[PDB]
């Protein structure tokens, strides 16, 4: 089928700066009626793809003029005059000239903003979860930038890697920060056999890791 090749795969841009992405088709997209059924879409985190450009170079319904599509033949380009926080997400090109209609691989635009240290919080298991025979120590690292961050768990000073599960949120479309939750799951028995539980975060915003911990019996 007509293959749509998008580049770059990802891309970082400072707010107030222009951006430009490419979409190349393995076959001409102009048809016998002079029309070029080529659309550009933006899928913000957690949302569904939304319209931007249609007919290859036409600004779609209610779309900010900051977006501009161009090109013909097999080479198409999407440009953003000046990136805003809500422009982050994955951009896709879609061709409707050749059946079956196909999408490009998408291009991810990351917003570039000032560094921001994480607000870390740690949480002991709940009384309820305990009585169930389980034990989870949850730790949150919210609103930080850039995405790169390393969290380490320590049970009474010793590092613990097994039974740890992490989850990151996509870049926030409002403040452009990232958040992450790290969870340490243990058997109720192994949990009650130790006293110190620490959550260690390393991030370029401080050469010394951010530390949060607690000891059973206190609060």
């Amino acid at each position: 089928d007509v293959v749509m090749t998008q580049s770059p795969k990802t891309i970082s841009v400072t707010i107030g700066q222009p951006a430009s992405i490419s979409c190349k088709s393995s076959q001409r997209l102009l048809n016998s009626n002079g029309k070029t059924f080529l659309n550009w879409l933006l899928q913000r985190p957690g949302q569904s793809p939304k319209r931007l450009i249609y007919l290859g170079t036409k600004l779609d319904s209610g779309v900010p003029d900051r977006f501009t599509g161009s090109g013909s033949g097999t080479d198409f380009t999407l440009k953003i005059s000046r990136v805003e926080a809500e422009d982050l997400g994955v951009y896709y090109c879609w061709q409707g000239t050749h059946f079956p209609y196909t999408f490009g691989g998408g291009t991810k635009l990351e917003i570039k903003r000032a560094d921001a240290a994480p607000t870390v919080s740690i949480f002991p298991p709940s009384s309820e979860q305990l009585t169930s025979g389980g034990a989870s120590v949850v730790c949150f690292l919210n609103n930080f930038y850039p995405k790169d961050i390393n969290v380490k768990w320590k049970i009474d000073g010793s590092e613990r890697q097994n039974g740890v599960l992490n989850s990151w949120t996509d870049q926030d479309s409002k403040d452009s920060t990232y958040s992450m939750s790290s969870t340490l799951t243990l058997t109720k028995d192994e949990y009650e056999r130790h006293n110190s539980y620490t959550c260690e975060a390393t991030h370029k915003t401080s050469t010394s890791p951010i530390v949060k911990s607690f000891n059973r019996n206190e609060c």
């Binding site: 059924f37 879409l41 740690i122 949850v138």
Partner: protein, 222 residues
Amino acid sequence: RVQLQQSGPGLVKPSQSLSLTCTVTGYSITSDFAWNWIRQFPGNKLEWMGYINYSGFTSHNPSLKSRISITRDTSKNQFFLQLNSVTTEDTATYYCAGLLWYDGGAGSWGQGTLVTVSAAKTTAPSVYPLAPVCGDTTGSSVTLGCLVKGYFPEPVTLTWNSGSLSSGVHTFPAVLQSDLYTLSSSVTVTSSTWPSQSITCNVAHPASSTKVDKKIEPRGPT
């Protein structure tokens, strides 16, 4: 304007038929558009499944040969998708979208509905509250949490105070463990608003018709 909305099962077993519905509002389906069904796989790859336009004409991708059928009900202004002999590969997010037949503009997509093809059985979730300590209940602000463990299939919709507490909220993507999902969520408010004002975690899990609340109460003395 035109708005689409999908509905359908969240879980379907291998070899069975997937049946989805898309209700359209703000425009007659018998006019101008091409009503499409598109799906998005785990790696975020998009695939066009097919459409049925304003005049009832249909067209579908050959990759789904003889397994797909797209029909409509002009009386309820809805169109549908029928996908036979599904396999775990069919697991994805299904969207409906309308684009103008003539030029492809004014495109509008629904919110999407997650569809899981698995033998695993539906399991309601467990909701544990996450209260701080006493070292963080004395400072700038305070972070409270909510742990949702061991459920299937996805998803679960989580809210704080039934949806009135929207800011300072972070709901992390679920992680599959033991064929059971785990998801956490934290909310942040002024260190002087809680516990004066109750904060509740509302967890909903369609697949099992579960709806449970979990109030965040202070540890130790209460």
